[PDB]
Amino acid sequence: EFIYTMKKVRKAHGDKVILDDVTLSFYPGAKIGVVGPNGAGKSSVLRIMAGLDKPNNGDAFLATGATVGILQQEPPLNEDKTVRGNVEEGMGDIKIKLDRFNEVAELMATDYTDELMEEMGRLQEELDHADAWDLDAQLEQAMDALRCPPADEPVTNLSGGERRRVALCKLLLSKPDLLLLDEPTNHLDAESVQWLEQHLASYPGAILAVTHDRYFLDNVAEWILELDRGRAYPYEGNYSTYLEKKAERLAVQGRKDAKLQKRLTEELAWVRSGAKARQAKSKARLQRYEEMAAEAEKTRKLDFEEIQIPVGPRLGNVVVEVDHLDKGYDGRALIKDLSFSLPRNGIVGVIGPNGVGKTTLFKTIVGLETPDSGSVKVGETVKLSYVDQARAGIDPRKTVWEVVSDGLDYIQVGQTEVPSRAYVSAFGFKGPDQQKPAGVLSGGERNRLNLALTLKQGGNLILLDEPTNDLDVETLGSLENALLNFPGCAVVISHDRWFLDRTCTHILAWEGDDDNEAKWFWFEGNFGAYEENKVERLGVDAAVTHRKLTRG
Amino acid sequence: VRPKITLACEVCKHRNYITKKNRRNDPDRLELKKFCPNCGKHQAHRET
Amino acid sequence: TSKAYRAAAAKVDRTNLYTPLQAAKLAKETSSTKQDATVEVAIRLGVDPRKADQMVRGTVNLPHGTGKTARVAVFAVGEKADAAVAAGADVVGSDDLIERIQGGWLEFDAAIATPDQMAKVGRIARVLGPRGLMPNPKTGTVTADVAKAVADIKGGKINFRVDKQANLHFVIGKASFDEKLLAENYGAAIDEVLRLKPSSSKGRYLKKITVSTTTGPGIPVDPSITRNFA
RNA sequence: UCGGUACGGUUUGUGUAGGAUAGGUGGGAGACUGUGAAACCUCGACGCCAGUUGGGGCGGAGUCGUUGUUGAAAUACCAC
RNA sequence: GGAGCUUGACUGCGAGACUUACAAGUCAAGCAGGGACGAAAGUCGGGAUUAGUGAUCCGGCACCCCCGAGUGGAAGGGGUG
Numbered sequence: 001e002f003i004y005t006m007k008k009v010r011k012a013h014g015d016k017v018i019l020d021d022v023t024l025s026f027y028p029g030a031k032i033g034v035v036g037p038n039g040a041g042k043s044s045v046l047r048i049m050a051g052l053d054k055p056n057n058g059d060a061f062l063a064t065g066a067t068v069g070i071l072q073q074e075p076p077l078n079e080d081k082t083v084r085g086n087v088e089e090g091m092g093d094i095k096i097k098l099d100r101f102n103e104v105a106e107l108m109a110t111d112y113t114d115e116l117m118e119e120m121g122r123l124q125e126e127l128d129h130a131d132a133w134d135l136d137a138q139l140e141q142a143m144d145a146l147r148c149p150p151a152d153e154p155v156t157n158l159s160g161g162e163r164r165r166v167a168l169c170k171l172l173l174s175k176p177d178l179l180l181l182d183e184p185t186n187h188l189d190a191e192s193v194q195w196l197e198q199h200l201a202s203y204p205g206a207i208l209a210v211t212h213d214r215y216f217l218d219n220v221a222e223w224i225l226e227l228d229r230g231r232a233y234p235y236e237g238n239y240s241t242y243l244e245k246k247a248e249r250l251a252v253q254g255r256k257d258a259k260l261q262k263r264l265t266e267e268l269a270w271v272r273s274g275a276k277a278r279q280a281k282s283k284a285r286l287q288r289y290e291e292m293a294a295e296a297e298k299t300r301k302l303d304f305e306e307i308q309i310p311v312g313p314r315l316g317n318v319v320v321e322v323d324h325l326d327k328g329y330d331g332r333a334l335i336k337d338l339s340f341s342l343p344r345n346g347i348v349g350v351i352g353p354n355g356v357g358k359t360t361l362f363k364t365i366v367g368l369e370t371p372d373s374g375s376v377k378v379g380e381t382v383k384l385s386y387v388d389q390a391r392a393g394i395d396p397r398k399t400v401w402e403v404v405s406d407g408l409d410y411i412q413v414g415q416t417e418v419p420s421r422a423y424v425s426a427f428g429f430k431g432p433d434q435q436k437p438a439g440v441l442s443g444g445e446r447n448r449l450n451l452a453l454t455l456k457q458g459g460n461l462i463l464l465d466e467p468t469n470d471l472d473v474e475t476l477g478s479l480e481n482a483l484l485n486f487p488g489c490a491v492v493i494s495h496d497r498w499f500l501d502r503t504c505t506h507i508l509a510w511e512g513d514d515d516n517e518a519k520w521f522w523f524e525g526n527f528g529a530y531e532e533n534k535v536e537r538l539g540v541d542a543a544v545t546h547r548k549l550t551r552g
Numbered sequence: 553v554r555p556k557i558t559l560a561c562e563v564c565k566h567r568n569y570i571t572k573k574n575r576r577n578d579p580d581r582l583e584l585k586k587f588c589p590n591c592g593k594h595q596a597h598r599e600t
Numbered sequence: 601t602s603k604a605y606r607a608a609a610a611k612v613d614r615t616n617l618y619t620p621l622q623a624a625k626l627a628k629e630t631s632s633t634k635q636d637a638t639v640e641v642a643i644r645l646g647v648d649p650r651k652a653d654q655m656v657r658g659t660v661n662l663p664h665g666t667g668k669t670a671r672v673a674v675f676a677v678g679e680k681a682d683a684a685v686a687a688g689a690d691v692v693g694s695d696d697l698i699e700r701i702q703g704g705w706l707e708f709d710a711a712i713a714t715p716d717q718m719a720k721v722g723r724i725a726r727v728l729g730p731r732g733l734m735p736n737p738k739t740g741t742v743t744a745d746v747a748k749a750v751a752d753i754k755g756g757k758i759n760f761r762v763d764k765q766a767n768l769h770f771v772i773g774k775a776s777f778d779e780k781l782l783a784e785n786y787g788a789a790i791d792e793v794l795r796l797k798p799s800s801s802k803g804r805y806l807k808k809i810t811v812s813t814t815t816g817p818g819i820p821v822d823p824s825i826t827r828n829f830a
Numbered sequence: 831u832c833g834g835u836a837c838g839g840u841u842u843g844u845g846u847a848g849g850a851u852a853g854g855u856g857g858g859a860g861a862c863u864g865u866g867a868a869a870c871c872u873c874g875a876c877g878c879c880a881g882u883u884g885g886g887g888c889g890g891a892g893u894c895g896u897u898g899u900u901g902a903a904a905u906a907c908c909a910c
Numbered sequence: 911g912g913a914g915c916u917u918g919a920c921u922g923c924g925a926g927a928c929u930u931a932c933a934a935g936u937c938a939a940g941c942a943g944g945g946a947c948g949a950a951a952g953u954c955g956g957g958a959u960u961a962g963u964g965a966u967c968c969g970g971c972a973c974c975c976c977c978g979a980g981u982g983g984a985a986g987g988g989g990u991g
C-alpha cells in the first residue's frame with residue numbers, strides 16, 4: 001500500500017547539497033506537487049525517483065508490483081516519425097512482440113509444426129491480455145486529444161514547442177503508476193494545459209508534478225513538497241500557502257542571525273581584553289567562542305542577482321515595419337495579409353496557440369528566413385539582439401565562462417569595456433559556477449546564460465522568444481521590471497496569461513479560424529482591455545468537453 | 553574539491569583502483585584503460 | 601427488485617455459509633423460482649493478475665457437460681472436414697468461410713480451426729478477439745487433432761480465466777441436471793483452481809466464493825470445503 | 831461525537847457512430863405487473879460534457895422496457 | 911618551449927643498500943604477466959629533486975568463499991583491496 005519510499009537519503013552535487021536526511025513516502029493516488037526556487041533540486045530528486053540517478057548515502061526504492069514513467073524537461077524525442085513516437089513507447093511493450101506476428105502473418109506450415117500451437121499461441125493471448133489487438137485504431141483516438149501534428153510528419157527540425165505535445169502523448173499512453181514530470185506547462189498553450197488539468201484529475205496512479213506556475217498546481221496537486229537548502233517539507237494547501245510559508249521561514253531564521261551576531265560582539269571584545277593580574281583567561285570561554293564563530297559562517301548566506309538589460313543606441317522614428325506579408329510552407333500557409341508598424345518605447349506581446357508561427361515571424365525579422373511575399377522595412381536606426389527558443393547559442397560541452405565570454409577576458413557589451421568574470425557574475429554564476437559545463441545547469445540557469453550571450457550586442461530592439469519559461473516567481477519579476485525600464489520596444493512571445501496582463505501595450509494576436517489559418521490582428525492596448533474587444537468583435541462570449549485519451 | 557574516487561572494472565566490476573580527480577574540472581566519471589588481475593588483461597574502468 | 605425476486609432472496613440467508621449439499625438445494629429453490637438455466641460460480645482469488653507468474657488461466661473437463669449447443673466452427677478441406685462433421689460440428693468450412701465471417705454472420709460458439717486453413721484467419725480474429733470468438737491452441741482449437749476436440753466441447757471443456765479485477769467466472773451448467781450432478785461439475789472446477797495456484801500466492805488463496813443463477817441472488821459457500829464436496 | 835476496520839444496502843463513470851455507452855468481466859433471451867402518462871415534485875444532491883433517476887404529488891386509470899441499428903462496444907434484469 | 915597518439919598515476923615480486931634507539935622513512939637494478947609509445951635501441955611501478963601529512967584500537971564498504979559451537983545452512987568471525 002506504498003508506491004515509492006526513501007530511507008535516510010542524502011544527495012549532493014559538488015559541495016552543494018540537494019538532499020540531507022530526507023525520509024518520506026508516497027501513497028497511490030497522491031497528487032503531489034513540487035515547488036521551490038531555481039537550482040534547489042527539483043529534478044535531482046526526480047531523476048532518482050525515476051531510477052536513473054543513484055543516491056549517495058541512503059536507499060531509494062520503488063515498490064515491486066508497479067511501474068514508472070518520466071517526462072524530462074527536455075524530452076529526448078528521437079527523430080523518426082510522429083506516428084512512430086506514440087507506440088515506440090507507451091505501446092513499446094507490445095512492439096517488441098508484434099514483430100513476431102508479422103513473421104507468422106500468412107501462417108505457413110514450413111519450419112514449425114509444434115510451434116504452430118505454442119509459439120503463435122502467446123501472440124493470440126498478448127493480443128488479448130493487455131487488450132492491445134489493433135494498436136492503430138485508438139492510437140488515432142489518442143492523438144486526437146493532444147491535438148498532435150499529422151501522422152506523416154518527420155520531426156527533423158519542423159517541430160518547435162510542439163515536441164512536447166508528442167512526449168505527453170507517449171507516457172500518458174504508457175498508463176504508468178508512478179507518474180513523474182518536470183514542468184509540463186513549459187511551451188504549451190492555454191488549451192493543452194487546460195486539457196491536461198482533467199486527464200491528471202481523473203487519473204488512477206501517483207503523480208509528482210514539478211511546476212512553477214500558480215494555476216496548474218492549484219488544479220492538479222493536492223499536497224505540496226517544497227525543497228529548501230537540502231531539507232524537504234510537506235504541506236496541505238496551494239501555491240499561496242508556499243509563498244507565505246517560505247516568507248516566514250526566511251524571516252524567523254533571519255531573526256536568529258540578528259541575535260547571534262549581537263552576542264558575537266561581546267564575546268569578541270572579551271577575547272580582545274587582556275588578562276588581569278593573577279587570574280586566568282578561562283579556557284572554556286575560548287572554546288565557547290572559537291566554536292561559536294563557526295555557526296556564524298555556514299548559516300548566513302544568500303544571493304540574488306537582478307536581471308538588467310543593457311542600454312543601446314538611439315532609436316529612430318521607424319523600428320521595423322511589415323506591410324502585407326505572406327509566408328507559410330508548402331500548402332501550409334500560415335501568414336496572409338498582415339500589416340503593422342512596430343512601435344517606439346513599448347512592449348509588444350505575441351499571442352497565439354501552438355503551431356501557428358510565432359517563432360518564424362522572428363526568423364524573417366532577424367533575417368534567417370526570407371518571406372514569400374510582402375515587405376519587411378527595417379531602418380538603419382536599429383541594432384538587433386535576439387534571444388531564442390532553441391537556446392542554440394549554448395554549447396553543452398564547454399563551461400559557463402566560455403559559453404558567454406568566448407575564452408577571452410574583456411567583452412564588448414554596451415560598446416564598453418566590462419570584464420568577463422564580472423559580467424557573468426551579474427547573472428548569478430559566480431566563483432565555483434564559472435567552471436561547470438552547460439548541460440549540467442538547471443532549466444533556470446539554462447534560461448539565464450541564454451540572456452547572458454544574446455544580450456551581449458546590446459541593441460535597441462530585442463526579441464524575447466519565450467522568456468517566461470523555466471524560471472520561478474522571483475527572477476520572473478526581475479525580468480518583469482527590467483523591460484518596463486527599458487528605453488524602447490522589447491517584443492515578447494508568451495502563453496502566460498498573467499505575464500502579458502502586466503507588461504504589454506501591443507497585442508499581436510492570432511484570430512485564425514477554419515477557412516483561413518493565417519489571420520493576425522494588430523492592436524494598441526494592454527492585454528486586459530484587448531479581451532473585451534474580442535468578446536464583441538468576434539462572437540458573443542465564444543472566444544470545452546474533454547477529449548478522452550483512451551476508451552479503456 | 554579533490555575527492556578520492558575509485559575505478560571499478562567494466563567486465564567484472566572489481567574495485568581495483570583508487571585515485572584523485574578535480575571535481576569541478578571533471579564533473580563526469582573518468583575512463584581509463586587499467587589492468588585487472590581477475591581477468592589478467594587490460595579492460596576499461598569507470599568510477600562509482 | 602421484483603416482488604417474486606425478494607421472496608427468493610428471503611429463502612436464502614445472507615450470513616450462513618453454505619455447502620454444495622445445500623447450494624444444490626438452493627438451486628432448486630431458484631429453479632422453481634427462475635428459469636432452470638446456467639448457474640454461475642464466482643471465485644475471488646488471492647492473486648494479482650499484473651505479473652506473469654501470478655497469471656491464472658486453466659481448464660477443466662466436466663463429467664456432465666455444460667448444457668449448451670456447443671457449436672464448433674471447422675476450417676478444413678479433404679478428410680479433416682469429413683472427420684469433424686461426424687464429431688458434432690455444425691459449422692464446417694474453409695478459407696471461403698472467411699468471407700462470410702465479416703459479412704455479419706458469427707452464428708457459432710467455438711472455432712476449432714485446422715492449421716492448414718489458416719490463410720486469412722489471423723487478421724479476421726481481430727473482430728473475434730474482443731468479441732471472444734477467437735481460436736486458441738490452449739483452448740484446444742488451433743490444433744492438429746480437430747476430430748476428438750469437437751466432442752470435448754460437447755463434453756464441456758469450458759475455459760475460465762481470471763480477469764483484471766481478480767475474479768474467476770465459471771459455470772456449472774443447467775439446473776436441468778440433478779442435485780449431485782451439480783457437485784460433480786462443481787468439484788471438478790475447484791479441483792482445477794487449486795492445482796492452478798501459482799508459485800507465489802501470498803496469503804490465503806481462495807478468499808471468497810459464491811454461486812448464483814441467471815436472475816437470482818448469490819450463495820455464500822465455504823472455502824474450507826476442498827476435498828469432500830460430495 | 832469524531833475516527834480505523836470488517837460485512838451489507840443504494841449510487842457515480844457521458845469525445846467521435848447511432849437513444850452524449852449506467853465502467854470492467856462472465857452469464858444472457860427475455861423483463862415489470864405496472865399508467866412510465868403528465869402536474870405544483872424534476873434523480874431540487876446530479877446540475878458543465880446532461881438528462882442521467884426520484885425528498886414524489888398517479889395512487890392498479892396501466893403504454894415504457896430483448897429494441898437483432900451505422901459502432902470498439904450498446905441496451906432488459908440480475909451476479910461477481 | 912611546441913606537437914602527435916596514449917594511461918606504467920599498473921598487478922605478482924624484489925638481490926643489495928641509505929638512514930636509523932625503537933617505530934618509521936628512503937633508494938632500488940633486475941624477473942614474469944599484461945600494456946603505452948618507438949622503424950628499432952629502449953624508456954615508463956606519477957610529477958627536475960626534497961614538503962602537501964597521522965601510529966594502534968574500534969568500526970564501514972566491496973570482493974575471495976577460509977572457519978561455521980550436534981549436522982545442513984545461517985549469525986558472526988577471518989583474508990586481500
Ligand SMILES: Nc1ncnc2c1ncn2[C@@H]1O[C@H](COP(=O)(O)OP(=O)(O)O)[C@@H](O)[C@H]1O
Binds near residue numbers: 014039
Ligand atoms: N551533474 C552535475 N554536476 C554538478 N552540479 C550539478 C549537476 N547537475 C546539477 N548540478 C547543479 O545542482 C543544481 C541541481 O539542479 P536541479 O535544481 O536539480 O535541476 P532542476 O532545476 O531541473 O531541478 C543545479 O543548480 C546545478 O547547477
Ligand SMILES: Nc1ncnc2c1ncn2[C@@H]1O[C@H](COP(=O)(O)OP(=O)(O)O)[C@@H](O)[C@H]1O
Binds near residue numbers: 161162332356360
Ligand atoms: N524547418 C521547418 N520547415 C517547415 N515547416 C516548419 C519548420 N519549422 C517550423 N515549421 C512549421 O511552423 C509551424 C509553426 O511555427 P512555430 O515556430 O512552431 O510556431 P510557434 O513557435 O508559435 O509554435 C508549424 O506548423 C511547423 O510545421
Ligand code: VO4
Binds near residue numbers: 354355358
Ligand atoms: O513554440 V511556441 O507555441 O512556445 O512560440
Ligand code: VO4
Binds near residue numbers: 037043073444471
Ligand atoms: O526544476 V527548474 O529550476 O529546471 O524549472
Ligand SMILES: [Mg+2]
Binds near residue numbers: 160
Ligand atoms: Mg515557438
Ligand SMILES: [Mg+2]
Binds near residue numbers: 042043182183442443
Ligand atoms: Mg527543472
Ligand SMILES: [Mg+2]
Binds near residue numbers: 577
Ligand atoms: Mg580537462
Ligand SMILES: [Mg+2]
Binds near residue numbers: 570571919
Ligand atoms: Mg596513486
Ligand SMILES: [Mg+2]
Binds near residue numbers: 924
Ligand atoms: Mg627487499
Ligand SMILES: [Mg+2]
Ligand atoms: Mg614485458
Ligand SMILES: [Mg+2]
Ligand atoms: Mg608498434
Ligand SMILES: [Mg+2]
Ligand atoms: Mg623499473
Ligand SMILES: [Mg+2]
Binds near residue numbers: 967
Ligand atoms: Mg586504546
Ligand SMILES: [Mg+2]
Ligand atoms: Mg552448525
Ligand SMILES: [Mg+2]
Ligand atoms: Mg558473512
Ligand SMILES: [Zn+2]
Binds near residue numbers: 564565588591
Ligand atoms: Zn576485470
